[PDB]
Amino acid sequence: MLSPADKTNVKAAWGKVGAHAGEYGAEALERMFLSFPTTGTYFPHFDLSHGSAQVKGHGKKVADALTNAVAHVDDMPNALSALSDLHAHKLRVDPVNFKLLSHCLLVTLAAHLPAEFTPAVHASLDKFLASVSTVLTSKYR
Amino acid sequence: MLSPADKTNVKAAWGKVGAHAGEYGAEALERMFLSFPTTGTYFPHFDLSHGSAQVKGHGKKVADALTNAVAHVDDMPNALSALSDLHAHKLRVDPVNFKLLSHCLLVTLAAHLPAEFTPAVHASLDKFLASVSTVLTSKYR
Amino acid sequence: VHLTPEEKSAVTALWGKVNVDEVGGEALGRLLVVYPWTQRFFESFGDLSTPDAVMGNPKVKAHGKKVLGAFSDGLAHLDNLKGTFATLSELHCDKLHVDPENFRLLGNVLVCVLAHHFGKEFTPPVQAAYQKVVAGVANALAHKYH
Amino acid sequence: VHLTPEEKSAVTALWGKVNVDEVGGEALGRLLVVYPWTQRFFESFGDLSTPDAVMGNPKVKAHGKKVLGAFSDGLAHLDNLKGTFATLSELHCDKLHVDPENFRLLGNVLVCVLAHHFGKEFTPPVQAAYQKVVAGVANALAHKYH
Numbered sequence: 001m002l003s004p005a006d007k008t009n010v011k012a013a014w015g016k017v018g019a020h021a022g023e024y025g026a027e028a029l030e031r032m033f034l035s036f037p038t039t040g041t042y043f044p045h046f047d048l049s050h051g052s053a054q055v056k057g058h059g060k061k062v063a064d065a066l067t068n069a070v071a072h073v074d075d076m077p078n079a080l081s082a083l084s085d086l087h088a089h090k091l092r093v094d095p096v097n098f099k100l101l102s103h104c105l106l107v108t109l110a111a112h113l114p115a116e117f118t119p120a121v122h123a124s125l126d127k128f129l130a131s132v133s134t135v136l137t138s139k140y141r
Numbered sequence: 142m143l144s145p146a147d148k149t150n151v152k153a154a155w156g157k158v159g160a161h162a163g164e165y166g167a168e169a170l171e172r173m174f175l176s177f178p179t180t181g182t183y184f185p186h187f188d189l190s191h192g193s194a195q196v197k198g199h200g201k202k203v204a205d206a207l208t209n210a211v212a213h214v215d216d217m218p219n220a221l222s223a224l225s226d227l228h229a230h231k232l233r234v235d236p237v238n239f240k241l242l243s244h245c246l247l248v249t250l251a252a253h254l255p256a257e258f259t260p261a262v263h264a265s266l267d268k269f270l271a272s273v274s275t276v277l278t279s280k281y282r
Numbered sequence: 283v284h285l286t287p288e289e290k291s292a293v294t295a296l297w298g299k300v301n302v303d304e305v306g307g308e309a310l311g312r313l314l315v316v317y318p319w320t321q322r323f324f325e326s327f328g329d330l331s332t333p334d335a336v337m338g339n340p341k342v343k344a345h346g347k348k349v350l351g352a353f354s355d356g357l358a359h360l361d362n363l364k365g366t367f368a369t370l371s372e373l374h375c376d377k378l379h380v381d382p383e384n385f386r387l388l389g390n391v392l393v394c395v396l397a398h399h400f401g402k403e404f405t406p407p408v409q410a411a412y413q414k415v416v417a418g419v420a421n422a423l424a425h426k427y428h
Numbered sequence: 429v430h431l432t433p434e435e436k437s438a439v440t441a442l443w444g445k446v447n448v449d450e451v452g453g454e455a456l457g458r459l460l461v462v463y464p465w466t467q468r469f470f471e472s473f474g475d476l477s478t479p480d481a482v483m484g485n486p487k488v489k490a491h492g493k494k495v496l497g498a499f500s501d502g503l504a505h506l507d508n509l510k511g512t513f514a515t516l517s518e519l520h521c522d523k524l525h526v527d528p529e530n531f532r533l534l535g536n537v538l539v540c541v542l543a544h545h546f547g548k549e550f551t552p553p554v555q556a557a558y559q560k561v562v563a564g565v566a567n568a569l570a571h572k573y574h
């Protein structure tokens with residue numbers, strides 16, 4: 001449950017991301033694949049090599065969805081219904097993995113938004129990614 | 142989210158627990174302490190000896206709370222608010238421990254309800270314990 | 283693993299009483315029913331639409347028997363699980379692409395199945411020994427992932 | 429842990445650029461802020477009511493340096509984190525009653541602080557090696573729990 005401060009914190013931080021979200025999407029994945037190699041089991045059809053167009057393209061897709069979620073911070077469940085469906089009924093990624101991508105996205109933002117990555121913003125973003133995670137895994141069973 | 146099916150399943154299995162809830166709660170704790178010793182760090186003030194009155198006493202308390210969530214299966218967030226607050230604000234039990242107690246509660250029920258512990262009931266009961274856990278951890282941050 | 287001798291005996295005594303054929307089918311079916319997401323690997327198994335469809339599917343029962351078969355072997359080399367499971371670990375990773383979290387879910391399901399079957403005989407301390415065992419196998423199975 | 433010579437060098441060399449004082453006070457404060465429940469062990473520290481209050485608390489800052497200190501000394505025994513943290517492992521269990529999960533949370537916080545600090549320098553491959561170390565340390569600290 002995101003507080004008003006949190007929603008603010010999140011909108012500010014993502015606000016700074018701007019035209020780079022896609023690149024940050026890609027970089028988070030790359031960090032995820034190297035750090036938690038088990039996450040690769042969901043992408044056997046991809047080339048996980050550095051700067052792979054597949055990873056790149058996928059980073060964009062993840063970024064855009066995050067953007068959309070920040071924009072509908074108030075109506076997440078609804079803004080991401082289709083994605084919750086896709087993941088629950090088609091992809092079927094085990095829920096433990098959502099914590100792994102979340103962490104990699106923090107790391108990525110930390111490394112690129114030094115001034116903006118304060119302890120309070122760090123707390124908000126974590127809660128945010130947790131909420132996004134919850135929504136995407138809400139129809140699993 | 143619990144379906145009508147789930148609710149019937151839960152009321153039915155818990156129905157059978159009846160008057161044994163206390164003893165089953167105590168037993169779930171003991172199994173938890175023996176299998177996942179790190180959970181003991183929250184009970185430094187307890188005698189965790191076999192048949193400790195404290196554990197016995199604590200088992201009733203937990204069982205009473207679960208019985209209470211079954212009784213209010215359509216308003217759990219409210220029926221458990223108090224307990225949600227206690228856990229978030231005073232006890233501050235790390236979230237991963239909930240999944241550990243859940244698991245041991247499932248083990249105990251299985252060991253005592255061979256006839257009712259069907260695949261379908263097992264699934265409903267798991268979803269139920271996950272929901273109770275989600276409630277008790279909702280106010281953590 | 284860290285199994286006291288008295289833990290290794292209790293594991294072994296009980297295991298003597300298990301019908302690997304039956305327990306195998308039960309554990310695998312219960313997994314597909316409690317954590318439906320795990321069905322992702324078995325779309326060629328057919329109808330897994332309801333609990334009855336899963337539990338009674340001849341392919342699920344057969345597979346379960348295979349899995350528990352391999353697990354029973356693991357119980358005789360409790361000293362070298364990583365060794366024992368090496369080729370299987372490589373296969374689950376490189377060919378099957380099975381996320382190792384699946385192995386921990388299956389372990390927990392197996393413990394419930396053993397509790398279901400043995401009732402009171404599955405004492406707090408026997409479960410503690412089996413918890414150590416299922417964790418070691420899941421670890422062994424994941425050891426070759428890269 | 430199971431660090432490659434290359435991975436060993438990357439850890440070793442970034443560390444050398446670390447101001448333990450600052451990184452340690454920041455890791456511990458962020459921990460208290462991001463995961464508020466960790467504050468259950470620091471009641472005696474004072475006012476942890478706000479991010480500002482945590483980050484400023486010198487008791488926090490000083491505890492942070494003591495923790496990173498010990499951690500720092502552990503990177504010198506990357507081949508025996510277990511024997512290096514054995515007494516610290518018994519202490520956390522038996523005297524402090526600290527749930528090992530906290531070790532994992534800090535590790536993760538630690539990695540976000542390093543990225544925060546080194547931006548560019550903290551590349552994916554360098555993060556991977558640190559991830560292996562934080563896991564390794566957490567594992568070692570949890571080792572003597574019973």
Ligand code: HEM
Pocket residue numbers: 039042043058061062065066083087091093097098101102132133136
């Ligand atoms: C932060 C939470 C996540 C978000 C917002 C997210 C979002 C997305 C989006 C937008 C897509 C593309 C949908 C389309 O093609 O229209 C997607 C697909 C996919 N996601 Fe998720 N995802 C998340 C977490 C995960 C995790 C943790 C994994 C696995 C570890 C994962 C695995 C996949 C896979 C395998 C695909 C399909 C890739 C392909 O075949 O092109 N997702 N996700």
Ligand code: HEM
Pocket residue numbers: 180183184199202203206207224227232234238239240242273274277
């Ligand atoms: C869904 C599972 C849980 C339920 C229903 C539950 C319920 C309760 C209840 C009813 C009490 C007593 C409060 C009172 O005095 O009125 C309690 C206290 C407590 N619980 Fe929880 N709890 C759960 C999970 C956990 C877990 C997983 C842990 C740690 C492993 C934990 C640690 C404690 C502690 C340390 C106390 C205080 C005991 C005492 O000093 O008397 N709880 N819980």
Ligand code: HEM
Pocket residue numbers: 320323324348349350352353370374378380384385388419423
């Ligand atoms: C105790 C843990 C497990 C053991 C010992 C085990 C063992 C085995 C064995 C012996 C095989 C056949 C190998 C071959 O085809 O050459 C197999 C195949 C397979 N296993 Fe595992 N397994 C385990 C857990 C799992 C779990 C939990 C899953 C998925 C949730 C899984 C997914 C599969 C799949 C998809 C196949 C191939 C089936 C086919 O199409 O023929 N396994 N396993």
Ligand code: HEM
Pocket residue numbers: 466469470494495496498499516520524526530531534565569
């Ligand atoms: C990197 C992992 C950690 C290391 C290396 C570590 C190390 C230390 C050291 C060297 C001490 C000094 C106490 C003494 O020698 O008497 C200490 C104390 C303590 N640690 Fe840990 N620690 C770690 C993680 C944690 C975490 C995550 C927590 C809780 C969130 C924690 C809670 C405490 C507490 C409560 C004390 C006692 C301080 C006092 O006496 O006021 N530690 N730790």
